[PDB]
């Protein structure tokens, strides 16, 4: 009944998250002219298992300066958030048809920043604390543009129902109508998901590991997997928003093939984009955001509200 669908959703999501470590080290290498993880497992099919098993068998360190109460809620607050965020995704017929799904996705996206904020406080180290402090301030600054991009896009779509996305985007991809906002949206995804040029914390040398500065194997599994988990989905959210497929009621297989391929290709570009650009300095993040990204997004929201009024093109919410 219902529960068997719950595991049938989150469990394949979780197992895909573990494997994404492989391609991060492999397709980068095949672009870096390296080989990527190949020796362990046929074609490196078993490296994520080897990666995940020691993290669940290595010693879980709790620094004496770390509050154990805060040390344990945060990794749960992060991973669980990523999984429950998947429930309104419109996989043919979504598991959760929340008519306010767009707000629902955005609301707990803001809830994500408590995961880093508490971890930075829990770790309680001078370098660690500032690293999280000037990490949360980045994520919150990128949500204002995130909301405005969303608000403009579904204004032409209709209501906030995530299932309506496939109805408005019937004949033409929505990107053809909001491509100036699509790249506006795509870079915003690159920043909330904590990936280069906004890797920042998880940067292997930017903040050595940022949210994982003192946070090693054991509980660290639920803090380096969650960021990669949001990567597949927030790209998939872009796939639904701007690259919507077709859904035949008598054959939902077509939209499963099309959406999965589209979101997998986007994640390739997401892994493509780390291996081609440097890291923004902290001031450059705000300079790019508040003074170039923020004004442009406002102007585009100016345009996308009048255009349905301009051409009598208001969408039906029902």
């Amino acid at each position: 009944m219902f529960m068997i669908n719950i595991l049938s959703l989150i469990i394949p999501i979780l197992l895909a998250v573990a494997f994404l470590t492989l391609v991060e080290r492999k397709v980068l290498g095949y672009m870096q002219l390296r080989k990527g993880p190949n020796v362990v497992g046929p074609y490196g099919l078993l490296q994520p298992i080897a990666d995940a098993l020691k993290l669940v068998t290595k010693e879980p360190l709790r620094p004496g300066t770390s509050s154990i109460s805060m040390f344990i809620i945060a990794p749960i607050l992060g991973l669980s958030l990523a999984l429950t965020m998947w429930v309104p995704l419109p996989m043919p017929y979504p598991l959760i048809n929340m008519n306010l799904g767009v707000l629902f996705m955005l609301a707990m996206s803001s809830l994500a920043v408590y995961s880093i904020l508490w971890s930075g406080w829990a770790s309680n180290s001078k370098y660690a604390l500032i690293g999280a402090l000037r990490a949360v301030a980045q994520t919150i600054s990128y949500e204002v543009t995130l909301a405005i991009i969303l608000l403009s896009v579904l204004l032409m779509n209709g209501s906030y129902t995530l299932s309506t996305l496939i109805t408005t985007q019937e004949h033409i991809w929505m990107i053809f109508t909001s491509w100036p906002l699509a790249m506006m949206w795509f870079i915003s995804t690159l920043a909330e998901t904590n990936r280069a040029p906004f890797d920042l914390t998880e940067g292997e040398s930017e903040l050595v590991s940022g949210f994982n500065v003192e946070y090693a194997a054991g509980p660290f599994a639920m803090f380096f997997m969650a960021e990669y988990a949001n990567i597949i989905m927030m790209n998939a959210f872009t796939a639904i928003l701007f690259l919507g497929a077709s859904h035949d009621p008598h054959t939902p297989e077509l939209y499963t093939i099309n959406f999965v391929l589209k979101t997998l290709a986007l994640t390739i570009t997401f892994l493509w984009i780390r291996a081609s650009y440097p890291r923004f300095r902290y001031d450059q993040l705000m300079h790019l955001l508040w003074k170039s990204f923020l004004p442009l997004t406002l102007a585009l929201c100016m345009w996308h509200i009048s255009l349905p009024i301009m051409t009598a093109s208001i969408p039906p919410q029902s």
Partner: protein
């Protein structure tokens, strides 16, 4: 001395002291410190290891090139001993398991192997042997810790005529499972000790004082046969440990005089976990039992090694238990425990 056994050097790492101290079961606490002392002036300390080489890896840094010669051995195998002490001019026993194992009956860990290594060493052609007994070693005591210690103590005494048997008191150190133990009732519960502590007086001793005792016993020729007892500087009634330890760690003091009846149940339940018996039924009455004076046998004080007070060095083991808010607190902020002693 033998042609190459003759000592040489200023007591450095690459100085030969001529003492070949094959220590038995050095992969824990006192073994770690004695080899550290043994390797300081330079000595071929052949350590028969039985666990994974990884856990024995940390003994390597305290020895010069070609000094810490780890050797595979097994307790049951008769030839296992004979190979590791064949050329050792001195043998320092350290075998023994403070907790219990199904394959290792508590008789063995203080009777079988200690007798199983004392006779081979005397057959090999050694000069000395040091088997570590307990300061309270007494078979008639209800302590299987004491019951197995005493019978094994006289067996090696009977087997080895020159068996310099050492009977230290409750030693304390970084991994003594005595201080870090007594800090652990806060984690476990409300200090389920017996009679609020006003029934037991013990005399803890700092491990380096103990370890310096054996090596000083090595150079001392008259130590053969004589049964030295390693005793701390001052005794301590059991309650004073509990409040002082909870003070030098800044832990919430929650004492509770739980009688021996229910405290014996929690011993077996701690052994229930089939990975390590945190507390055993032997450890139930182990702490309730007090330390006898034992004044006739000579101590380390006349051997040249003085005794360091417990309150002099507590956070060196207990700063780990100190929370972040109070990790910086030293002895001075904490009152000294009542020295119930001689």
């Amino acid at each position: 001395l033998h042609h190459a056994l003759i000592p040489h050097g200023k007591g450095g790492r690459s100085s030969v002291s001529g003492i070949v101290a094959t220590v038995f079961g050095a992969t824990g606490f006192l073994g770690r410190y004695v080899v550290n002392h043994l390797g300081r002036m330079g000595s071929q300390v052949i350590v028969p290891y039985r666990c994974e080489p990884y856990d024995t890896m940390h003994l390597r840094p305290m020895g010069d090139l070609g000094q810490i010669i780890f050797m595979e051995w097994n307790g049951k195998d008769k030839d296992s001993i004979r190979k590791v002490v064949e050329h050792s001019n001195v043998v320092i026993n350290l075998v023994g398991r403070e907790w219990e194992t199904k394959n290792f009956d508590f008789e063995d860990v203080f009777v079988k192997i200690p007798h199983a290594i004392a006779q081979v060493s005397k057959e090999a052609g050694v000069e000395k042997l040091i088997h570590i007994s307990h300061l309270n070693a007494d078979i008639k005591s209800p302590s299987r810790y004491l019951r197995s210690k005493a019978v094994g103590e006289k067996e090696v005494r009977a087997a080895f005529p020159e068996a310099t048997i050492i009977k230290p008191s409750d030693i304390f150190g970084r991994e003594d499972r005595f201080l870090n133990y007594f800090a652990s009732m806060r984690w476990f519960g409300g200090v389920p000790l017996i009679s609020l502590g006003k029934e037991t007086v013990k005399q803890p001793v700092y491990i380096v004082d103990v370890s310096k005792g054996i090596i000083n016993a090595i150079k001392d020729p008259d130590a053969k046969g004589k049964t030295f007892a390693f005793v701390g500087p001052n005794r301590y009634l059991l309650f004073d440990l509990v409040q002082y330890i909870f003070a030098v760690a800044y832990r919430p003091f929650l004492p509770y005089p739980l009688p021996h009846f229910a405290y014996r149940w929690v011993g077996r339940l701690f052994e229930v976990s089939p990975f390590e018996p945190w507390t055993t039924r032997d450890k139930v009455e182990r702490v309730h039992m007090s330390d006898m004076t034992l004044p006739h046998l000579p101590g380390l004080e006349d051997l040249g090694i003085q005794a360091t007070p417990l309150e002099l060095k507590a956070i060196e083991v207990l700063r780990r238990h100190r929370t972040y808010r109070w990790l910086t607190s030293e002895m001075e902020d904490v009152k000294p425990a009542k020295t119930v002693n001689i």
